[PDB]
Amino acid sequence: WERDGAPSPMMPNEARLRNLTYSAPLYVDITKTVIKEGEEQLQTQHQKT
């Protein structure tokens, strides 16, 4: 991620030259369910957290 925040693929040579870490973003699908003892259940999923 550049200073402006623009993502770009990181080549291994650029990581070597610019002293970066060759890392891949990790995302996880998270499903959240909430119960409020009111015989209603709300299930909201946050894809790729």
């Binding site: 550049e2 650029e14 030259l17 610019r18």
Partner: protein, 44 residues
């Protein structure tokens, strides 16, 4: 003060104050140009 872009190899004059970046490429790795001064090598 010429810097050569590592991606497109564009020579661009860059001031000390302004940010270091390829004018047209946008690349962020810059190489200094070879000195114009003359250095002698003995072929030994």
């Amino acid at each position: 003060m010429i810097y050569i872009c590592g991606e497109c190899h564009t020579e661009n004059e860059i001031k000390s104050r302004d940010p270091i970046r390829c004018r047209e490429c946008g690349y962020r790795i810059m190489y200094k140009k070879r000195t114009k001064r003359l250095v002698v090598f003995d072929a030994r």
